[PDB]
Amino acid sequence: GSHMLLEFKQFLYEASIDEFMGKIASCQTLEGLEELEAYYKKRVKETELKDTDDISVRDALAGKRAELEDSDDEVEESF
What we know:
The protein is 57% helix and 0% strand. The protein has 4 helices and no strands.
């Protein structure tokens, strides 16, 4: 069946944004987005993330961060 093309961009350039942009768009909490932000920083030495993931996802993750930071009304700091 299907496998990595080994000599092309395409399989990586789908890789970048396949669930992660959803995972941040769904993060529901800045405190979680920030854990996603640490998990992004934890991961991308363990793999590669090219240019493509980093901009697309960060601009979204940071995209959400401002929203979520408006949404700072989170657990125990405000119950």
